Amino acid sequence: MVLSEGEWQLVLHVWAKVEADVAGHGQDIFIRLFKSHPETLEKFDRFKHLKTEAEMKASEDLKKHGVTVLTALGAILKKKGHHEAELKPLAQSHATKHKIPIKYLEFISEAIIHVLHSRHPGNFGADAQGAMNKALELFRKDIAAKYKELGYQG
Ligand code: HEM
Numbered sequence: 659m660v661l662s663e664g665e666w667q668l669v670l671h672v673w674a675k676v677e678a679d680v681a682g683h684g685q686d687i688f689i690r691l692f693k694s695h696p697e698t699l700e701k702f703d704r705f706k707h708l709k710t711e712a713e714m715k716a717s718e719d720l721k722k723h724g725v726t727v728l729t730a731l732g733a734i735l736k737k738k739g740h741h742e743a744e745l746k747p748l749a750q751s752h753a754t755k756h757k758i759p760i761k762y763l764e765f766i767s768e769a770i771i772h773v774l775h776s777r778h779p780g781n782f783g784a785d786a787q788g789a790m791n792k793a794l795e796l797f798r799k800d801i802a803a804k805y806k807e808l809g810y811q812g
Pocket residue numbers: 698699701702703704726727728730731747748751752756758762763766
């Protein structure tokens with residue numbers, strides 16, 4: 659699949675807003691993910707002890723992790739589809755070291771859309787959400803293909 663320049667513009671326009679507060683968006687997204695799909699929390703040995711949203715918000719390590727994740731995702735989105743090089747190491751660590759099923763990538767994609775919808779309604783209307791979903795589907799599709807080449811079905 660391929661996004662048009664118009665769709666990329668919608669994606670990058672709302673992403674520019676997210677970059678005004680990467681740490682904050684990172685926390686909201688992971689808290690949403692962990693609360694909505696608690697099973698994903700078990701994949702993080704560093705955070706699986708967190709019991710409440712309050713503890714999650716107060717975790718300095720979780721906040722730093724969120725920044726690392728969103729920074730990596732932002733770099734991929736800014737490539738506008740030409741992300742082969744960026745995807746290689748990400749696909750290897752998540753398939754081989756962390757063992758993250760494609761299903762879980764769908765869950766975090768849902769969390770990202772939910773947070774952008776809540777925080778940026780004016781810049782995240784129907785068309786913008788469709789563009790973001792398409793960009794994330796492309797990401798998940800290419801990651802899945804790499805998973806297979808690497809020997810991980812998940
Ligand atoms: C938007 C998709 C995602 C991106 C861009 C992303 C990115 C990253 C990055 C850059 C790191 C640090 C470097 C590395 O280990 O490769 C990381 C670590 C990790 N990711 Fe992801 N990730 C994504 C989704 C997920 C999901 C859905 C899970 C599982 C629910 C997951 C689990 C992990 C784990 C367990 C680590 C190691 C954390 C640690 O122990 O420090 N990731 N991820």
